[model samples]
Target: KFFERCELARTLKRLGMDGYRGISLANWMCLAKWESGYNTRATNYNAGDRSTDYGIFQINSRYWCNDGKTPGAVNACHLSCSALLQDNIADAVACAKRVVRDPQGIRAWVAWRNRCQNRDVRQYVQGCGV
Candidate 1:
């Protein structure tokens, strides 16, 4: 489920991603770009098929998906780790929404901090009709 730049941007817009939780569509684009390069199969699992990150948005299994590997992690997204790897991004979008619902806002992602924060991200969605 790898996607092109504008293509992913347009789809995110269609999924109500623009300005979601006070975050810009461009920022989301930047997050996905830096985190997964629009590749849905992307994963950053640090603990052998569990824990750490998974899929495009790199949703963590400990706190978001129900890998049940952590001691007291809350599966706030209520999704399976497998769901985030699918071609369908509906669950991924929904879980990402839930993630921002927490107080940390979009700073939840370290990649967003280093790669996207305070950078010129307009190029991520520049030519998109979003």
Candidate 2:
């Protein structure tokens, strides 16, 4: 499920992330673009630790999901990493919210740290009509 930015915005809004849980849809769009380019099947392998990040939010196997390959995986979301690859994002959203609840908030995402922190991403939704 590769979403157009507008569709993604609307979906996030419906998920109560339209600034509801301290994450704005604009910030989510920016994070998704940098993390997975809005592709549901996106998976990034980290050679350094033989770990993988999955789906739109790039949830990592090391902490949030279990791939059965990464040793000592925490599985914070108690979900298989493959689940995040689905076209539907229900579980992904739930897991992402859990991740954000940590003390770091969205800063848990390095992409957010490098690109979204303290920035005005509202423009990402300017014409989306979300």
Candidate 3:
């Protein structure tokens, strides 16, 4: 599913992404926009680590979800990577929360740091009533 921007924001808020782990909903929105263009079934291959980044948040296989190929991988989210590919995004959102629980917080996503961090992310959630 390629979500409409505000619809994605509302759904994420309903999933408690509004401030999970102290990261704002707008930030998460920005991350999702840049990482997956609000699309489900987005998969990024990272052969360098024998891993892939999956779903809207682009959760990585090397540490968060198991793709059955990442070397010495840790499935911290405790689910197969396939779950992240769904259009529903519920499991993907849950795994994304688990990801931010780490000490790095939202910085766990490099895309967030590179694109969302220190930027004016208000546009992502503006007018959404989140």
Model 3 residue 21 CA deviation (Å) reads 1.6
Model 3 residue 80 CA deviation in Å: 0.8
Task: Give the per-residue lDDT of model 3 (tens digit) for 1-130.
Answer: 9999999999999988988878899999999999999988899898777889999988999888988989899999999999999989999999999988889999988888899899999999889989
Give lDDT: candidate 3, residue 74. 92
Winner of 1 and 2 under TM-score: 2
User: Where in model 1 is the C-alpha error above 4 Å?
Assistant: 48-50, 68-71
TM-score of each: 0.92, 0.95, 0.96
Q: Give the per-residue Cα lDDT of candidate 2 at 52.
A: 94
Give the per-residue Cα lDDT of candidate 1 at 113: 96
1-130 in candidate 2: lDDT tens per residue?
Answer: 8998888988888887777567788988999988999998999899999899999999999999999999787899989998899998888998999898888888899999898888888878988888
Model 3 bad stretches (over 4 Å): none
What are the per-residue Cα lDDT tens digits for candidate 1 across 45-84? 6766447687778888878987666556678898877889
Ranking by lDDT: 3, 2, 1
Give the Å error, residue 19, model 3: 1.1
